[PDB]
Design an enzyme around this catalytic site. Structure first.
Site, PDB file in Angstrom:
ATOM      1  N   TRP A 118       1.032   5.027  11.353  1.00  0.00           N
ATOM      2  CA  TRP A 118       2.408   5.355  11.711  1.00  0.00           C
ATOM      3  C   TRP A 118       3.339   4.159  11.527  1.00  0.00           C
ATOM      4  O   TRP A 118       4.339   4.274  10.836  1.00  0.00           O
ATOM      5  CB  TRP A 118       2.516   5.907  13.142  1.00  0.00           C
ATOM      6  CG  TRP A 118       3.929   6.041  13.599  1.00  0.00           C
ATOM      7  CD1 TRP A 118       4.914   6.836  13.047  1.00  0.00           C
ATOM      8  CD2 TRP A 118       4.540   5.343  14.683  1.00  0.00           C
ATOM      9  NE1 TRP A 118       6.092   6.672  13.742  1.00  0.00           N
ATOM     10  CE2 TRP A 118       5.891   5.763  14.749  1.00  0.00           C
ATOM     11  CE3 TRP A 118       4.069   4.412  15.631  1.00  0.00           C
ATOM     12  CZ2 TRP A 118       6.787   5.270  15.715  1.00  0.00           C
ATOM     13  CZ3 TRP A 118       4.954   3.937  16.601  1.00  0.00           C
ATOM     14  CH2 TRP A 118       6.302   4.363  16.629  1.00  0.00           C
ATOM     15  N   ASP A 145       3.242  11.205  11.173  1.00  0.00           N
ATOM     16  CA  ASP A 145       2.762  11.021  12.557  1.00  0.00           C
ATOM     17  C   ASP A 145       3.896  10.780  13.554  1.00  0.00           C
ATOM     18  O   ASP A 145       3.696  10.891  14.752  1.00  0.00           O
ATOM     19  CB  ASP A 145       1.714   9.894  12.666  1.00  0.00           C
ATOM     20  CG  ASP A 145       0.482  10.172  11.838  1.00  0.00           C
ATOM     21  OD1 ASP A 145      -0.294  11.084  12.223  1.00  0.00           O
ATOM     22  OD2 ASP A 145       0.303   9.496  10.788  1.00  0.00           O
ATOM     23  N   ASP A 146       5.094  10.446  13.066  1.00  0.00           N
ATOM     24  CA  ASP A 146       6.204  10.172  13.973  1.00  0.00           C
ATOM     25  C   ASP A 146       6.509  11.447  14.792  1.00  0.00           C
ATOM     26  O   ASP A 146       6.702  12.527  14.217  1.00  0.00           O
ATOM     27  CB  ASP A 146       7.433   9.675  13.177  1.00  0.00           C
ATOM     28  CG  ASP A 146       8.543   9.158  14.087  1.00  0.00           C
ATOM     29  OD1 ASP A 146       8.649   7.920  14.270  1.00  0.00           O
ATOM     30  OD2 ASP A 146       9.289   9.998  14.636  1.00  0.00           O
ATOM     31  N   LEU A 147       6.509  11.332  16.121  1.00  0.00           N
ATOM     32  CA  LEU A 147       6.731  12.508  16.996  1.00  0.00           C
ATOM     33  C   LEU A 147       8.119  13.150  16.842  1.00  0.00           C
ATOM     34  O   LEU A 147       8.243  14.362  16.877  1.00  0.00           O
ATOM     35  CB  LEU A 147       6.473  12.153  18.457  1.00  0.00           C
ATOM     36  CG  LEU A 147       5.009  12.471  18.758  1.00  0.00           C
ATOM     37  CD1 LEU A 147       4.174  11.216  18.933  1.00  0.00           C
ATOM     38  CD2 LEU A 147       4.954  13.365  19.981  1.00  0.00           C
TER      39      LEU A 147
END
Ligand SMILES: [Hg+2]
Ligand code: NA
Ligand code: NA
Length: 293
Positions: free
Chosen positions: A221, A239-241
């Site tokens: 990430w 992967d960044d929320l």
């Protein structure tokens, strides 16, 4: 006075809205629609400020030399994202959801960068690990205040992100004092020891990915975020929320999707423009979603 003349209009207000804490020197300060910071230019910090005089003209003022203008102009065009968005916009128009994003933030144009050096981009990506962006930016402001360059020019203060040298001097404990966890402080100091770090921008994606992830505490990430937001590469940090939330809201009616599914969407729908679309997704996540019990 120097002037940057654009082929296409840019919405300056939307460019400035991208900054999360405009008043606080992070190191950037935005006050009454005028952006400013100190940049290090040939081993010395100079004052630079910029603001629109029209839809297609950005004025730059600062205390650098006239012969340094070409270099400063290149840096600002890349950082603020002032390049002709015609082709991006054509592409976004071809997808119902991208068109929706383009119209919501119309005039934002192409993505800039979130740092004015590779070192700054890596340090800030590390700071952000496991915390909110707003908390990360306050931490940046603490570090800039104590360890960053300061230039007084006209009546105004211009702040810069700490040089690698300034960080080595601050040390692990100086960074911890400003609020950083011990490991984060440790990793930033580690990165500060690296020579020729600005060259990372010109490396290939895969080589740069393996270099970043070769540090213990930098994983997929952080490396992909650096690649896109600091290095200007078309690597999409799935992967960044915030990214997952935005892509899910746009395409999956709010049903939260996995990073692998988001990657699949970016491959299918974002193509060569994934890095520009990423900045629109950050705005969307911040401004149209970020209850009731
Ligand atoms: Hg001038
Ligand atoms: Na700021
Ligand atoms: Na690693």
């Amino acid at each position: 006075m120097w002037r940057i003349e654009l082929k296409h209009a840019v919405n300056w207000e939307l460019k400035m809205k991208f900054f999360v804490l405009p008043e606080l020197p992070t190191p950037d300060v935005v006050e009454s629609g005028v952006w400013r910071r100190a940049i290090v230019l040939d081993g010395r910090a100079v004052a630079v400020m910029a603001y629109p005089e029209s839809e297609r003209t950005i004025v730059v003022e600062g205390n650098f030399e006239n012969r340094e203008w070409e270099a400063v102009r290149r840096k600002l065009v890349e950082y603020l994202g002032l390049q002709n968005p015609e082709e991006l916009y054509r592409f976004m128009d071809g997808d119902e959801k991208l068109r929706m994003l383009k119209n919501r933030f119309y005039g934002f144009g192409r993505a800039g960068l979130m740092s004015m050096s590779v070192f700054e981009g890596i340090a800030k990506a590390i700071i952000q690990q496991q915390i909110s962006f707003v908390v990360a930016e306050k931490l940046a402001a603490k570090i800039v205040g104590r360890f960053g360059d300061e230039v007084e020019w006209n009546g105004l203060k211009f702040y810069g992100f700490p040089t690698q040298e300034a960080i080595l001097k601050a040390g692990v404990e100086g960074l911890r004092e400003c609020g950083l966890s011990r490991r984060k402080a440790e990793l930033i100091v580690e990165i500060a020891k690296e020579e020729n770090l600005e060259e990372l921008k010109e490396w290939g994606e895969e080589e740069a990915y393996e270099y970043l992830t070769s540090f213990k505490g930098i994983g997929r990430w952080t490396a992909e975020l650096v690649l896109s937001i600091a290095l200007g590469k078309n690597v999409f940090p799935a992967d960044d929320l915030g990214v997952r939330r935005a892509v899910s809201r746009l395409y999956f009616n709010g049903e939260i999707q996995s990073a692998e599914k988001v990657r699949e969407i970016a491959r299918e729908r974002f193509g060569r423009f994934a890095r520009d679309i990423l900045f629109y997704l950050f705005l969307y996540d911040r401004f149209f979603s970020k209850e009731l019990v």
